[PDB]
């Protein structure tokens, strides 16, 4: 009840509480704000294209492939899985928010009222060489998504008591910044995701740099404002070896975030 002075759910602890993600996170509004293919060459649209070109390169051009991929903190989105369904036989989607899981389930069932991913899907098809059209690509993704589960990156068992085989890849886009109030929790969340991975499994992360908040309309949500060095240090202390790390300077529209670019990394679960 602070009226934009401070992010929603943070007056007491300094960071957006996770119950705020069950009450004030609107899936439909988050999708309209950031994913109606951003907008007409907007900062959001350029960022989405850059995210899509990196996932295509990681999954289709590089050696990131296997049986199971677990997407962590998927929200109501599926763009991050379009290229991945080409390298992984099965995908599991997860989020802390029940309204985000409902939105994902609406898309899985191709409910007419669901969000339209068509332009994003066609862009991914174009990147992959136009071997299939959008509608064929979406059905391949829908059949590959085997489970839609509740997730909490802060718990030692992120997926609760749900048994899954060790994953070949753990993917997490624009989630860890929103979920982790500090670097010790951020480091611990990367250790928690490690328990879902086979020894030597891939960890794929894409998030924002130096961002202390992000907006969903006039609703402000916290983000951990960490830099490249702090990201690399936390990924290494969580028990991972970084294969590649990229940083772009492109930031979100001034009215939606205060970030200083984005990062992408592909890491591998260490020996121990
Ligand atoms: N502790 C927690 N554990 C898991 N997910 C969490 C979480 N706290 C927040 N989240 C989720 O983190 C997401 C931030 S939005 C990221 C959505 C999507 N992956 C994309 O690329 O746009 C939300 O869906 C929110 O529910
Ligand atoms: N989901 C999204 S969109 C966006 C823009 C800028 C910063 C962040 C952000 N997130 C969560 C992490 C922090």
Q: Total domain count for the chain?
A: 1
Q: Could you tell me which of 194, 216, 189, 210 has the C-alpha nearest to residue 259?
A: 210
State the Cα–Cα distance between residues 45 and 124, nearest whole angstrom. Answer: 14
State the Cα–Cα distance between residues 113 and 103, nearest whole angstrom. Answer: 10
Q: 204 in ligand 1 pocket by Cβ < 6 Å?
A: no
Whole-number Å distance, alpha carbon 208 to ligand 2 midpoint, is 6
Do the beta carbons of residue 204 and residue 170 sit within 8 Å?
A: yes
Nearest CA to ligand 1 atom 13: 175
Q: In the sheet that 88-95 helps form, which strands lie side by side, from edge to edge?
A: 145-150, 88-95, 66-71, 167-173, 197-208, 262-269, 240-248
Burial classification of residue 18, based on how many CB atoms lie within 10 Å of its CB (0-12 exposed, 13-18 middle, 19 or more buried) = middle
Ligand 1, atom nearest to 172 Cα: 19
Ligand 1, atom nearest to 74 Cα: 19
Nearest CA to ligand 2 atom 10: 174
Q: Are strands 167-173 and 197-208 parallel, antiparallel or unpaired?
A: parallel
- Token pair 């679960």 in the structure block, residue: 269
Task: Using most ligand atoms within 8 A of CB, pick from 43, 223, 261, 264 the residue to mutate for ligand 2.
Answer: 223
Q: Are strands 88-95 and 66-71 parallel, antiparallel or unpaired?
A: parallel
The domain of 252 spans: 1-272
- Token pair 């059949």 in the structure block, residue: 143
Give the method of determination.
Answer: X-ray
Question: Which residues does the chain break after (C to N > 2.5 Å)?
Answer: none
């Amino acid at each position: 009840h602070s009226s934009g002075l401070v992010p929603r759910g943070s007056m007491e602890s300094g960071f957006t509480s996770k119950d705020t993600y069950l009450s004030h996170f609107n899936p439909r509004d988050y999708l309209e704000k950031y994913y109606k293919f951003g907008s007409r060459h907007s900062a959001e649209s350029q960022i989405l294209k850059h995210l899509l070109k990196n996932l295509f390169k990681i999954f289709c051009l590089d050696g990131v492939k296997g049986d199971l991929l677990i997407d962590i903190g998927s929200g109501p989105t599926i763009y991050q899985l379009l290229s991945a369904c080409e390298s992984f036989k099965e995908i599991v989607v997860t989020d802390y928010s029940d309204q985000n899981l409902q939105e994902l389930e609406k898309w899985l069932k191709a409910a007419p009222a669901a969000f339209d991913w068509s332009p994003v899907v066609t862009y991914v098809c174009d990147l992959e060489g136009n071997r299939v059209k959008g509608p064929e690509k979406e059905e391949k993704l829908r059949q590959a998504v085997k489970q839609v589960l509740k997730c909490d990156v802060t718990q030692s068992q992120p997926l609760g008591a749900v048994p899954l085989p060790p994953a070949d890849c753990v993917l997490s886009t624009l989630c860890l910044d929103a979920a982790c109030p500090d670097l010790p929790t951020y480091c611990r969340a990367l250790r928690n995701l490690g328990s879902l991975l086979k020894p030597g499994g891939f960890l794929v992360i894409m998030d924002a740099l130096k961002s202390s908040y992000y907006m969903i309309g006039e609703q402000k949500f916290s983000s951990l404002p960490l830099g490249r060095e702090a990201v690399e240090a936390a990924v290494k202390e969580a028990g991972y070896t970084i294969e590649w790390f990229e940083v772009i300077s492109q930031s979100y529209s001034s009215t939606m975030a205060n970030n200083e670019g984005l990062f992408s990394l592909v890491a591998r679960k260490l020996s121990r």
